[PDB]
Chain A
Amino acid sequence: GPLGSQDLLELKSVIKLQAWWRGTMIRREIGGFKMPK
């Protein structure tokens, strides 16, 4: 059967945050990343 309400919400939501954070580090050149010249 399915996850409970909060666990499903947390799964969906943490993945949004992870994906956004990975995007953010590229856009803001955080953590060692630098755009090519």
Chain B
Amino acid sequence: LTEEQIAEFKEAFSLFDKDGDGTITTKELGTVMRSLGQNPTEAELQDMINEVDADGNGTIDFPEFLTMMARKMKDTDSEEEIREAFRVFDKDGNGYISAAELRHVMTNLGEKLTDEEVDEMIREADIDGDGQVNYEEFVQMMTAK
């Protein structure tokens, strides 16, 4: 990545480096990567943590962090990828999913969301307050700068 970009990863990394020793820890890794646009799964995050912990020390320096950020990095049109994933659950194929159904699948399949996590999703997704989620508009709003 560009010098400007790496400076951006470094700025983020350094924000979570509590005492300026040039390391963060496994307890900050997910948050830093997310803050920079990554969406690791829970299993992926745990495996990156396991990599760090392989030597029984839980700290991560900047080159190690860049290595983990870059590894199998896969660019796409992210908003579209997410819209497509929602479309899988659009059972009547109409651009909408009910708030109840979205809550159900998000908490009963896969890396299930906690009640706190899904409560926020539904609060953000149903902007017309009508029990329905227009997922294209939801993803647009969540991707805005």
Contacts and interface: CB of A to CB of B under 8 A. Distances in A.
Interface stretch (B29-37, B47-55, B65-73): B29-37
Contact of A21 (B38, B105, B113): B113
Given A14-B106, A18-B111, A26 B31 contact: yes
A31 B117 contact: yes
Given A17-B85, A20-B82, A27-B35, 16 more contacts: A10-B105, A10-B109, A11-B109, A14-B85, A16-B39, A17-B82, A17-B106, A18-B106, A18-B111, A18-B112, A22-B42, A23-B38, A23-B39, A26-B31, A28-B142, A36-B15
Interface of A: 9-11, 13-28, 30-31, 35-36
